[PDB]
Amino acid sequence: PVPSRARVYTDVNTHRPSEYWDYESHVVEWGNQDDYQLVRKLGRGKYSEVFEAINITNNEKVVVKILKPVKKKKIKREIKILENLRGGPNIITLADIVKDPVSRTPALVFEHVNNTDFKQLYQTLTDYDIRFYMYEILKALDYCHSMGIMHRDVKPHNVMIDHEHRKLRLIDWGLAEFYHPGQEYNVRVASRYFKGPELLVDYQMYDYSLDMWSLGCMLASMIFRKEPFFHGHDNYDQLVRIAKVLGTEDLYDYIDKYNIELDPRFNDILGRHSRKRWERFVHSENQHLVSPEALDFLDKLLRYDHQSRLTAREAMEHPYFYT
Amino acid sequence: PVPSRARVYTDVNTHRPSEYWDYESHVVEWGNQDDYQLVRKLGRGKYSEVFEAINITNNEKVVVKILKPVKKKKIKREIKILENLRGGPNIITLADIVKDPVSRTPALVFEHVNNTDFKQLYQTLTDYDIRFYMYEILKALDYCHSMGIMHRDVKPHNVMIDHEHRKLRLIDWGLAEFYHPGQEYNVRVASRYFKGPELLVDYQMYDYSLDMWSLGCMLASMIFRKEPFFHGHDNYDQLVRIAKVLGTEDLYDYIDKYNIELDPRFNDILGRHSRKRWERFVHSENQHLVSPEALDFLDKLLRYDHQSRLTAREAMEHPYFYTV
Ligand SMILES: Nc1ncnc2c1ncn2[C@@H]1O[C@H](COP(=O)(O)OP(=O)(O)O)[C@@H](O)[C@H]1O
Ligand SMILES: Nc1ncnc2c1ncn2[C@@H]1O[C@H](COP(=O)(O)OP(=O)(O)O)[C@@H](O)[C@H]1O
Ligand SMILES: NCc1ccc(-c2ccccc2F)c(Cl)c1
Ligand SMILES: [Cl-]
Ligand SMILES: [Mg+2]
Ligand SMILES: [Mg+2]
């Protein structure tokens, strides 16, 4: 396959010392979990149990993410990235790293976010709200990208919104990775619906632009009221769902531009598809959220070619954000 | 001790929401320092390293104050105050808040001021320039006081003057605090020479008037060409230097009015001193900067009783500023 590199923040990690990006050598100091009293279960993830808790030293509400010890490399990577981004705009704040004395189970302590339900937000979100929150996500992404980090799991469940306070936080940095130009990465990242064409075709030399595809999927789902927007039933079917909207023409142009070898399992399912017009998705139920600005912006995010997608900083200058 | 409150802007913070003054709960969003290239060291403070820098996105000169991390409460307090005062007249502008990706050291980014040397300014200032710059400082103080903030470190080193452009900025908001009536504050603030009598006698219920005393010290040092004007060698000696000018009689009236208890360490050093006439500091080298209006104005700033000092807004109406 043809090599590729990010169009922005290409060499930010190459120009930094090993200690910034080498998480395998990073020393993690695990505090005592006795300083935290667990209150109630908030959620349950892939390899974690999330609780609301009270810091008994200052009477402050926190969130404790108890981790199921999978590769220690993965835990170290999540801690290092959270420490590098600590304080960044709309990035969840890692407040502490603790271990329970008896269980020895790792636990990450975060600032508490009073999260508004996805279904509840879906019904009450106006055109202005979508522009406002989309801008807040772009701040978090331009920041973590400037810090040489790819989130690689952008989706509505990894975006905490406290609608009352108009507070947004990008969470779940468990799949995040340091961008090194020319590096070949694992393509089994992101959630199915938000996976970029680059991951589905097994093109390993991807970058920050992966996050811009996932963000495009979120925007299309919100303005068109169709969640998820690309509803694959598996990873191969996921590419077919995309192909049914952006066509097999641009798809073959993309695979030819980067000299990508398609898996044989794609022959009997891919077929031939024309490129759709973003206007067909407009209906009576979503017309109040759609605008020529929103369609032009979406068109510039949902592109097969990862190099042709808007960067987070370019996306922030788009006329769609005149608010 | 007898309670005291400011005569101006007394309740401005009590009538505001907690968001304005609760700095401990304020959320700080730390940008990326990669947008700034450091050029040279400009100064080094008690807990900061100050650099001239270039914003590489617009090729603009800025100042980057690298903070030696003391209590994070103090950094949060300085950021919140700078954000509340951002845009105010003659207040340094906080342009950005950033952290170095590797070091994770907090840094504040300010507008650049091309500061004229204290010694160079001291040699070239005329009666007019002093009245002019004194007025510019009063705008910054009346403004921050109206915003419920006490600077608490007013001195010539915290006042940037670009004499070529007649540009003045009040900097270093690291000791600044929100005024809450009846609150007892830490008296270990301001620089020795500029400490008001209220701090030296350990009277904790002070206000904005502290800033007016420090401004009076700056005015006396400029018009009389004696820097510092009250040259203490320690905090107790600092009160003795003041008493040698204002006299011990008004000092005892001040502590009696507020029922303050003097520290026993003041007994063998304070002595007895008469109040000196301000005209006694006039000499051949400073008479071109002295006038009856300047002496009357100074007399109304350099008062033991913090309540009897002119407020910044009253100070602006004084005949000393007829020229401006
Ligand atoms: N800061 C937070 N405030 C409130 N709830 C949170 C916070 N962080 C995580 N959660 C909750 O925990 C769930 C899972 O957390 P997450 O970090 O995404 O881990 P996982 O990768 O195991 O799913 C989220 O969907 C959310 O409901
Ligand atoms: N905006 C500025 N422009 C130019 N010089 C400045 C500016 N801000 C600070 N400095 C320089 O840096 C020095 C120290 O800055 P300061 O804010 O007073 O920090 P500290 O609280 O640590 O003493 C100043 O005395 C001055 O020489
Ligand atoms: N940066 C050194 C400096 C030098 C002189 C002054 C000054 C000017 C006019 C009146 C009173 C003054 F003390 C100031 Cl504010 C600062
Ligand atoms: Cl009173
Ligand atoms: Mg200073
Ligand atoms: Mg400063």
Swiss-Prot record, chain B:
Q: Under which name does UniProt file this protein?
A: Casein kinase II subunit alpha
Identify the catalytic residues: D153 (proton acceptor)
Q: Which residues of the full protein are shown?
A: 4 to 327 of 391
- Enumerate the catalysed reactions: L-seryl-[protein] + ATP = O-phospho-L-seryl-[protein] + ADP + H(+); L-threonyl-[protein] + ATP = O-phospho-L-threonyl-[protein] + ADP + H(+)
EC number(s) reported in the record:
2.7.11.1
Q: Which UniProt keywords apply?
A: Apoptosis, ATP-binding, Biological rhythms, Cell cycle, Disease variant, Intellectual disability, Kinase, Nucleotide-binding, Nucleus, Phosphoprotein, Serine/threonine-protein kinase, Transcription, Transcription regulation, Transferase, Wnt signaling pathway
Kindly list the places in or outside the cell where this protein is found, as annotated in its UniProt entry. Nucleus
Task: Report the source organism.
Answer: Homo sapiens (Human)
| Free-text description of this protein's post-translational modifications in UniProt | Phosphorylation does not directly affect casein kinase 2 activity, but may contribute to its regulation by forming binding sites for interacting proteins and/or targeting it to different compartments.
Which residues does the annotated region (Interaction with beta subunit) include? 33-38
* Location of the Protein kinase domain: 36-321
